[PDB]
Coordinates of C-alpha atoms (C1' of nucleotides) and ligand atoms in Angstrom, one line a residue:
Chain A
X784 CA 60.9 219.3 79.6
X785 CA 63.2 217.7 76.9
X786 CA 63.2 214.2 75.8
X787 CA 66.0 212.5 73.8
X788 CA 65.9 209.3 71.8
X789 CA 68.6 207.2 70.4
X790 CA 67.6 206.3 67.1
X791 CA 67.8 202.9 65.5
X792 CA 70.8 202.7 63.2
X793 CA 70.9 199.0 61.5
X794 CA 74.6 198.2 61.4
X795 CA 75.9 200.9 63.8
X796 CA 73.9 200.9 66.7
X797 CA 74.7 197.7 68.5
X798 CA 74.2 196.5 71.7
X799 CA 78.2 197.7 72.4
X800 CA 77.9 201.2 70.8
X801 CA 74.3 201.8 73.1
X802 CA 76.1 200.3 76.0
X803 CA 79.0 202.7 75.4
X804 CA 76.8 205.4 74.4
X805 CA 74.4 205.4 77.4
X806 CA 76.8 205.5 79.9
X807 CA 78.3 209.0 79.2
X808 CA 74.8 210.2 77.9
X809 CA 71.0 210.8 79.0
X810 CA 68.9 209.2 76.8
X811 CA 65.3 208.5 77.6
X812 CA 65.5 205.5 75.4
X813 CA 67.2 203.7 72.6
X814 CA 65.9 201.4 69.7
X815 CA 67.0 198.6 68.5
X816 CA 68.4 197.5 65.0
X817 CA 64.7 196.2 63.1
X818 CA 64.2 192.8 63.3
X819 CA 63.1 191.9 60.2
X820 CA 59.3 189.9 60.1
X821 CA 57.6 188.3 56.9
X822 CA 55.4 185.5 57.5
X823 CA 57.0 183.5 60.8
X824 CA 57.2 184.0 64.0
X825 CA 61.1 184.4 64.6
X826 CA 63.2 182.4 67.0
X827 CA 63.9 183.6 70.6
X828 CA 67.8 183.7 69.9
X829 CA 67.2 186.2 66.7
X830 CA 65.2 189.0 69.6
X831 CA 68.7 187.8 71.9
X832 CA 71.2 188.3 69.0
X833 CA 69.5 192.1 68.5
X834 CA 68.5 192.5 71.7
X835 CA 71.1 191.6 74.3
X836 CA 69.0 193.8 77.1
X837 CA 66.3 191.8 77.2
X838 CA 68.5 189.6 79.7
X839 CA 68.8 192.7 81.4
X840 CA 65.3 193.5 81.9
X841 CA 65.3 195.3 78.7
X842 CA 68.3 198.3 79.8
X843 CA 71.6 199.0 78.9
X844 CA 74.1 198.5 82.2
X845 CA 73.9 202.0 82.9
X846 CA 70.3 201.6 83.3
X847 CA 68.7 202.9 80.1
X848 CA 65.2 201.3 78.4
X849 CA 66.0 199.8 75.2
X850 CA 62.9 198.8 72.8
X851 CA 62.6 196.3 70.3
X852 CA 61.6 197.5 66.5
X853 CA 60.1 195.0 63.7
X854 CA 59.7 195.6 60.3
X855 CA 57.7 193.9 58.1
X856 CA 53.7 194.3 56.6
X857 CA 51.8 191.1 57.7
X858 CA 49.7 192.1 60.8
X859 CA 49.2 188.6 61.8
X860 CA 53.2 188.0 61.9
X861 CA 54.0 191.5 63.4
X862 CA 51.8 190.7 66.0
X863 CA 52.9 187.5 67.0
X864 CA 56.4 188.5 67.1
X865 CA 55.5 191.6 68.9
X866 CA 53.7 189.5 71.4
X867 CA 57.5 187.8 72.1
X868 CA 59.5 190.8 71.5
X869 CA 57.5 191.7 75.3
X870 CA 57.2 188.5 76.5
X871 CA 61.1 188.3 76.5
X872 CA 61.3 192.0 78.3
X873 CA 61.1 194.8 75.9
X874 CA 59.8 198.0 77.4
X875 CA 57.1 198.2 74.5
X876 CA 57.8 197.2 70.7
X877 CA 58.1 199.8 67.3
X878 CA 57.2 199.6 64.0
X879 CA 59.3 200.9 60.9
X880 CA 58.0 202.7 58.2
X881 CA 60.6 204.6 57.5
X882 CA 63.6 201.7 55.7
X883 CA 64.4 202.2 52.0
X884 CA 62.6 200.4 49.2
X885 CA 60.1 192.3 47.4
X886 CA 58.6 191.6 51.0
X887 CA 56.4 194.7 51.8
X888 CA 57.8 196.9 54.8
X889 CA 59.5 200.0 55.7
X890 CA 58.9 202.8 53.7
X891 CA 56.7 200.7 51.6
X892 CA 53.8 201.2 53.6
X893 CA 53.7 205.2 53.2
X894 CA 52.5 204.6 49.6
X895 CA 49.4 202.6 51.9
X896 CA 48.6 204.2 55.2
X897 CA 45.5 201.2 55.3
X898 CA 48.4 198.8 55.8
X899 CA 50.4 200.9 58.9
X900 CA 46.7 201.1 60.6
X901 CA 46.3 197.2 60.1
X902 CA 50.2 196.6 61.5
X903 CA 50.1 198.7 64.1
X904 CA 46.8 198.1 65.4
X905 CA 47.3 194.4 65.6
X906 CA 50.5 194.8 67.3
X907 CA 48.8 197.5 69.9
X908 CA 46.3 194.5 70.7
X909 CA 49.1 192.1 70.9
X910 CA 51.2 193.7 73.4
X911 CA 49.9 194.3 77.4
X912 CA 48.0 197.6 77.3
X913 CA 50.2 199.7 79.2
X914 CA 53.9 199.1 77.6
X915 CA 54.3 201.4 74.7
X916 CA 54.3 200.8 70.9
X917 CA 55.8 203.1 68.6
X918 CA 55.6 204.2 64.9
X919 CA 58.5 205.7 63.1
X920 CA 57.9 206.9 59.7
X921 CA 59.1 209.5 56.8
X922 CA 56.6 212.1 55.3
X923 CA 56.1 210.0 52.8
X924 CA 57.7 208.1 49.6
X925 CA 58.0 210.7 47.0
X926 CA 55.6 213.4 48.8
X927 CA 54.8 214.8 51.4
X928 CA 50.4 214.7 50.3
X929 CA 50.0 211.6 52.4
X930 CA 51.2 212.5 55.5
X931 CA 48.0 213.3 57.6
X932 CA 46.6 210.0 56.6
X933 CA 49.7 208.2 57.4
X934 CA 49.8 210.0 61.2
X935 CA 46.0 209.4 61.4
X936 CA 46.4 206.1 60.7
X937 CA 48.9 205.5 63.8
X938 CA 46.9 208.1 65.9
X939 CA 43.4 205.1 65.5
X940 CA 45.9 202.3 65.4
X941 CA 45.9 203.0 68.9
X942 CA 49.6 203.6 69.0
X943 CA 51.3 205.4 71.6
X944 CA 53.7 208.4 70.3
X945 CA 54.9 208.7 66.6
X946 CA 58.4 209.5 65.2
X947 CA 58.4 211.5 62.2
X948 CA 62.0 211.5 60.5
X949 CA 61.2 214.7 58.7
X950 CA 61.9 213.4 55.1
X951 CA 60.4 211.4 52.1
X952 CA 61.9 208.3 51.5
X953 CA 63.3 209.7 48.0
X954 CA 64.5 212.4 49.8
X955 CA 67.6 210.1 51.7
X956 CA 69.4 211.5 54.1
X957 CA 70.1 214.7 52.3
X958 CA 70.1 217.9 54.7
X959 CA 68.5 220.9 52.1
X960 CA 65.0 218.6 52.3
X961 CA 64.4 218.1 55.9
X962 CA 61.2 219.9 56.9
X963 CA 60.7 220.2 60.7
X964 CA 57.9 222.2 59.6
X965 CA 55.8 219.4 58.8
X966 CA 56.6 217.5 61.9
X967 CA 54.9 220.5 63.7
X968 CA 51.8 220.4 61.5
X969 CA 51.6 216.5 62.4
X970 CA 51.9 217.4 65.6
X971 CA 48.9 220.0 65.5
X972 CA 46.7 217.4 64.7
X973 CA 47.3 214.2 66.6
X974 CA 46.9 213.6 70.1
X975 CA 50.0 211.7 70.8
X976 CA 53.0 212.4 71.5
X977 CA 55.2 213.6 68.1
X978 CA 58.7 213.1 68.6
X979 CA 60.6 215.0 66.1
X980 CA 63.7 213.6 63.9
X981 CA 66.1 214.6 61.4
X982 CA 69.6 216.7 61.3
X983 CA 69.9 217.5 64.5
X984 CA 73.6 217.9 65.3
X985 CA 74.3 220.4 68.4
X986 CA 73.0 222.4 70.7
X987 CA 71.7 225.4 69.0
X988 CA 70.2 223.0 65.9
X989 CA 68.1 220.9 68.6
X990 CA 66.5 224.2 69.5
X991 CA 65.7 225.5 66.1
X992 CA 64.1 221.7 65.6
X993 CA 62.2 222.0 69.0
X994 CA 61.1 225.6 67.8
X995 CA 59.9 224.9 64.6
X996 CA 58.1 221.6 65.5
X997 CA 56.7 222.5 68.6
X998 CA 58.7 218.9 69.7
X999 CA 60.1 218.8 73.1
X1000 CA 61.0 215.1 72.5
X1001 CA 63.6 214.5 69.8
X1002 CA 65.5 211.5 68.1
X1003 CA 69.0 211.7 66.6
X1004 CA 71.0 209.5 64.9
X1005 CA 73.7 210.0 63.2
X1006 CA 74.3 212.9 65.1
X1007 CA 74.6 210.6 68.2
X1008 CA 78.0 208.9 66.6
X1009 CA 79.9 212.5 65.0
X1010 CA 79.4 213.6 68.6
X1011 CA 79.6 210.8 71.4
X1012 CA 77.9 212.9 74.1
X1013 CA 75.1 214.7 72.0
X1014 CA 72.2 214.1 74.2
X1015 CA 73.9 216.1 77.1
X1016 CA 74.8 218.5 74.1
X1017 CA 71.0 219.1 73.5
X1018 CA 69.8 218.9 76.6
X1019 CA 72.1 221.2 78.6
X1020 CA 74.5 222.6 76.3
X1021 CA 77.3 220.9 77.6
X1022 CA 80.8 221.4 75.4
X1023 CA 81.2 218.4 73.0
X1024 CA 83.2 215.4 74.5
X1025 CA 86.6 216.5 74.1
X1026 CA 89.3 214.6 71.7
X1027 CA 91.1 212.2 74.2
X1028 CA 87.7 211.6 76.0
X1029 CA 86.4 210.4 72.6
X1030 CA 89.5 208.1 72.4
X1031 CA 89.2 206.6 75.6
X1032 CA 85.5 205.9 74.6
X1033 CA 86.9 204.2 71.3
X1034 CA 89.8 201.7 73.4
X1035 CA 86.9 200.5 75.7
X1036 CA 84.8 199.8 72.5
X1037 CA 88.2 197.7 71.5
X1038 CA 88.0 195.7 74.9
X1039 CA 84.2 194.8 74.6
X1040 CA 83.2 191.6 73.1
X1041 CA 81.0 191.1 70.4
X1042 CA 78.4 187.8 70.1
X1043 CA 79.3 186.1 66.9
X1044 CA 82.0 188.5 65.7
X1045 CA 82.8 186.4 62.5
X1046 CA 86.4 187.9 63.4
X1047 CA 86.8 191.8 62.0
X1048 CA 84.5 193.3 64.1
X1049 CA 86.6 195.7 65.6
X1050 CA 88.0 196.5 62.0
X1051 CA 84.5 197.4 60.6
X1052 CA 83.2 199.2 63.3
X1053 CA 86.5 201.4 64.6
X1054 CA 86.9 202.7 61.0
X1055 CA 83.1 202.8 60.8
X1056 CA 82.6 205.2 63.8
X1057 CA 85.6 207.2 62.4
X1058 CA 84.3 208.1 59.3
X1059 CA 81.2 209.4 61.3
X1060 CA 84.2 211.8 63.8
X1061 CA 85.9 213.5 61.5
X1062 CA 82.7 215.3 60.3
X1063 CA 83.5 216.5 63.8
X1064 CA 86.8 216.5 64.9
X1065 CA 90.2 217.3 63.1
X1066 CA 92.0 214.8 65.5
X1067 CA 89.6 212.0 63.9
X1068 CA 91.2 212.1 60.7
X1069 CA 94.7 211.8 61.7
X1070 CA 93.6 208.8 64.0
X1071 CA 91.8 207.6 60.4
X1072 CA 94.9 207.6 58.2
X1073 CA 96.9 205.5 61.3
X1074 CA 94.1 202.4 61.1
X1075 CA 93.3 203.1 57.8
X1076 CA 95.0 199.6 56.4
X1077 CA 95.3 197.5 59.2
X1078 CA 92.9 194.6 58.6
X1079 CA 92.6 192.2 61.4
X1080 CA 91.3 192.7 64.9
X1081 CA 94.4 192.5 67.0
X1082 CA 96.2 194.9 65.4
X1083 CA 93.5 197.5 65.1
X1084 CA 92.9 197.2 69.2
X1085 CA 96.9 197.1 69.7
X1086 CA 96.8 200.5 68.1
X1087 CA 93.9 201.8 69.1
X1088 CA 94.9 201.1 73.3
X1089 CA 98.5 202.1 72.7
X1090 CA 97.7 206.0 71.9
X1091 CA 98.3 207.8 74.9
X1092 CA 95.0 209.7 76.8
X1093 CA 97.6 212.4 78.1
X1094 CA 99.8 213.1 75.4
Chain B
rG732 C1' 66.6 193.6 18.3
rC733 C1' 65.1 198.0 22.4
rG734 C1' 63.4 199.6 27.6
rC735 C1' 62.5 198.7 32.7
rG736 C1' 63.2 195.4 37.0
rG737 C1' 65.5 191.0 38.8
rA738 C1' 69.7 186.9 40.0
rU739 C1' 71.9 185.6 47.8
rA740 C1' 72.8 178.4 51.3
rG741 C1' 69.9 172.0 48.5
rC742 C1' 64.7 175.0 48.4
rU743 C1' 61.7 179.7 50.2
rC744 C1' 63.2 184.1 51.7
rA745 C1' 66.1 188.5 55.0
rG746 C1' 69.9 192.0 54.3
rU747 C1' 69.6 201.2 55.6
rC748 C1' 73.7 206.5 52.8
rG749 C1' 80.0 200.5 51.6
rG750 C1' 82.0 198.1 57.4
rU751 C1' 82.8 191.9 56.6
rA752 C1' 75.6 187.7 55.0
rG753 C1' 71.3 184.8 58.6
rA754 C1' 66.2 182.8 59.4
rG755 C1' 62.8 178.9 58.1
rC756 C1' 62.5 174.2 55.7
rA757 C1' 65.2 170.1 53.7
rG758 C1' 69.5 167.6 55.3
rG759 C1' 73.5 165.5 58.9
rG760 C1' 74.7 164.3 64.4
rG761 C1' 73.0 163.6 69.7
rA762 C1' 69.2 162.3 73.1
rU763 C1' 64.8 159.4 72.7
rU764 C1' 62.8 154.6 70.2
rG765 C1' 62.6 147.6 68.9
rA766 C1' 63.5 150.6 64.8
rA767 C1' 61.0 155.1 63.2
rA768 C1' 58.2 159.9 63.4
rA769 C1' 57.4 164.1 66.7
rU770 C1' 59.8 166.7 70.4
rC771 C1' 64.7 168.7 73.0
rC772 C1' 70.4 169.6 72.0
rC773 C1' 74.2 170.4 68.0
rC774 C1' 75.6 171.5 62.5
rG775 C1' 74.1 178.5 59.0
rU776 C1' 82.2 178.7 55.4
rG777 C1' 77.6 180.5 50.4
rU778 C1' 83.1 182.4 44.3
rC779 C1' 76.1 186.9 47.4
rC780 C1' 75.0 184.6 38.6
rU781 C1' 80.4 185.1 36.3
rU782 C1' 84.2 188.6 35.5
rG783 C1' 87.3 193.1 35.7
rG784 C1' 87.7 197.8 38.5
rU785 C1' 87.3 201.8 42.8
rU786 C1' 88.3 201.4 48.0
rC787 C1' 91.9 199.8 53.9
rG788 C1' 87.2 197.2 53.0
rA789 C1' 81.9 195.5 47.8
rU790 C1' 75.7 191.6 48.3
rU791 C1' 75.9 197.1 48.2
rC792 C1' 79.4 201.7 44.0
rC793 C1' 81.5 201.6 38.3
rG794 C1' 82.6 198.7 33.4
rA795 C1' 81.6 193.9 30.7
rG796 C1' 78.9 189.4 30.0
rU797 C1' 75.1 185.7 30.9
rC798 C1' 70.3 184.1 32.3
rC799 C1' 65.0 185.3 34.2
rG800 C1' 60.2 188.4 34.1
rC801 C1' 57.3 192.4 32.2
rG802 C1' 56.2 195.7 26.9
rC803 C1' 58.2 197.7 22.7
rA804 C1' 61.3 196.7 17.8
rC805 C1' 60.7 191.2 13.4
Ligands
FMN2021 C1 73.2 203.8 58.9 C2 71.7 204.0 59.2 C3 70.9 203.0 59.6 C4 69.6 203.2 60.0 N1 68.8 202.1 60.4 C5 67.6 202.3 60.8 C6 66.9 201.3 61.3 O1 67.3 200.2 61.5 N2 65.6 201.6 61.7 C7 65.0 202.8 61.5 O2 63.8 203.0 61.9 N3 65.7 203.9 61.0 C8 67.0 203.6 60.7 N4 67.7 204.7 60.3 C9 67.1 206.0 60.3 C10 67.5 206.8 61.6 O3 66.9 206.2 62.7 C11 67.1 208.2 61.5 O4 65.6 208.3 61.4 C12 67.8 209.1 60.4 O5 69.2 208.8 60.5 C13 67.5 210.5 60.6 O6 68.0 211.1 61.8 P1 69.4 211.8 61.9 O7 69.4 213.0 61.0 O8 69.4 212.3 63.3 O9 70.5 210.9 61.5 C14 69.1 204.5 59.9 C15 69.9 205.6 59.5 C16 71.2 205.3 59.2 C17 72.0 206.5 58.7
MG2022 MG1 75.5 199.7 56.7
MG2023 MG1 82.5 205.2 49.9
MG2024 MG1 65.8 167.4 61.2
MG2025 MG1 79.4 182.3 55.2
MG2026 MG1 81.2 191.6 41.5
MG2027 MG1 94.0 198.7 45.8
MG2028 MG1 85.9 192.6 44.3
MG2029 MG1 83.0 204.6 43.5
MN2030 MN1 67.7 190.7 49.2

RNA sequence: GCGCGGAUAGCUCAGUCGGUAGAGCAGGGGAUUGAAAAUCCCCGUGUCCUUGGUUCGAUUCCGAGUCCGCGCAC
């Protein structure tokens, strides 16, 4: 039966927005924003600044397993950072292969499967045997032809379950490329898990993923932000979270405090997660155009907590 | 002169469809020391090369200019 993944989203996926997130959801597991390696080992307050969990035995307060993801190309570095990524509590470490376009990483090593079996492997033998480490990747960079050899590559890495975002990296985020079909051919051939990812946005488009695939694990992303309660969506059909339930969510978001906020916060990340409703809900627009210009903290949670739930 | 790619803190670098830039090192302060170094605590406010524009909001998108590297006009 189903799995659902919250997906990494650098910039938008916080510790708030996966505490908030997780609570009205059931996710099997969230990933962090990247933390980005080149040739150091990184302080422990960069993991704690990404990672808040870890002080939390690597969960959310609701309870759910949070795990840390590098990216970066230099397998000695990866590894050592891995090595404290666990020693500091994350349930397992991932690698990117997947982050647009320099310092090689991300997407960069699809043109070079040789370099994702180096990475990985040396993070697999860094990290205690039985916590997990991931692999998220695209098809490719600008095909598709490498995309065995990148999958075999994490498969005798030693690696424990692969993501496959179900597009190039020239392919974006645009919706007419994604191929799920691929992502079931992967999965043919491997013997990990494959957990499928790309456009899913509902109920009925998780089951044409899962059926074409052959995935009964999934990640979503975006998805997980235009509808605040998509994993119970997906997993049993559930209504999406209804209007004032989505604006209660957004006034707690406004009461929870952010490390470091270099003071506009709130202001980013209320319009932010906005823009991302109102590919969903009418009300979201209306609520847009009343924040629209205010542009400091207090008086975007003033409004924000002043709409009333039951009018 | 023409293409393509660059320009981020004193230096080396990080920076996901636009959401408010942060590590390491140097350096400054504390502890420590006879005084130092090393170690531990603290300092990360940059016209994001300059400029105009779009936008509620630009390192990011658009125009202009400069300088740098590569390969083509003397
Ligand atoms: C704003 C944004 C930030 C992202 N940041 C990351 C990231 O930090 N790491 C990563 O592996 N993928 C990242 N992704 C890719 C997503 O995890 C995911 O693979 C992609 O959005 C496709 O899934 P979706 O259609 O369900 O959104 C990001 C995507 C978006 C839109
Ligand atoms: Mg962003
Ligand atoms: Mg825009
Ligand atoms: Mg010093
Ligand atoms: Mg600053
Ligand atoms: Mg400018
Ligand atoms: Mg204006
Ligand atoms: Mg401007
Ligand atoms: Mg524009
Ligand atoms: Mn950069």
């Amino acid at each position: 039966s189903m799995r659902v993944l919250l997906a990494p989203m650098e910039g938008v996926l916080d510790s708030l927005v996966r505490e908030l997130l997780t609570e009205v959801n059931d996710y099997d597991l969230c990933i962090t924003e990247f933390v980005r390696v080149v040739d150091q080992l990184l302080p422990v307050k960069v993991f704690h600044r990404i990672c808040p969990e870890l002080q939390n035995a690597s969960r959310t307060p609701s309870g759910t397993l949070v795990r840390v993801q590098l990216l970066g190309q230099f397998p000695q570095w990866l590894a050592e950072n891995a090595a404290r990524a666990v020693e500091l509590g994350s349930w397992g470490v991932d690698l990117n292969c997947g982050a647009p376009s320099g310092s090689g990483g991300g997407a960069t090593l699809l043109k070079d499967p040789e370099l994702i079996y180096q990475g990985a492997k040396a993070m697999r033998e860094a990290v205690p045997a039985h916590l997990p480490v991931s692999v998220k990747v695209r098809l490719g960079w600008d095909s598709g032809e490498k995309k065995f050899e990148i999958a075999d590559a994490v498969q005798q890495a030693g690696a424990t379950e692969l993501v496959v975002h179900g597009r190039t990296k020239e392919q974006g985020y645009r919706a007419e490329h994604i191929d799920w079909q691929a992502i079931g051919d992967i999965r043919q051939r491997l013997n990990i898990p494959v957990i499928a990812n790309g456009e899913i946005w509902d109920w009925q488009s998780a089951q044409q993923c899962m059926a074409i695939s052959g995935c009964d694990a999934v990640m979503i992303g975006r998805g997980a932000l235009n509808i605040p309660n998509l994993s119970r969506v997906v997993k049993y059909n559930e209504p999406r979270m209804p209007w004032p339930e989505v604006v209660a969510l957004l006034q707690k978001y406004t009461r929870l405090e952010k490390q470091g906020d270099t003071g506009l916060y709130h202001v980013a990340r209320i319009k932010q997660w906005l823009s991302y409703l109102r590919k969903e809900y009418d009300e979201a627009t209306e609520l847009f155009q009343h924040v629209r210009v205010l542009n400091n903290s207090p008086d975007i949670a003033r409004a924000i907590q002043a709409i009333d739930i039951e009018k």
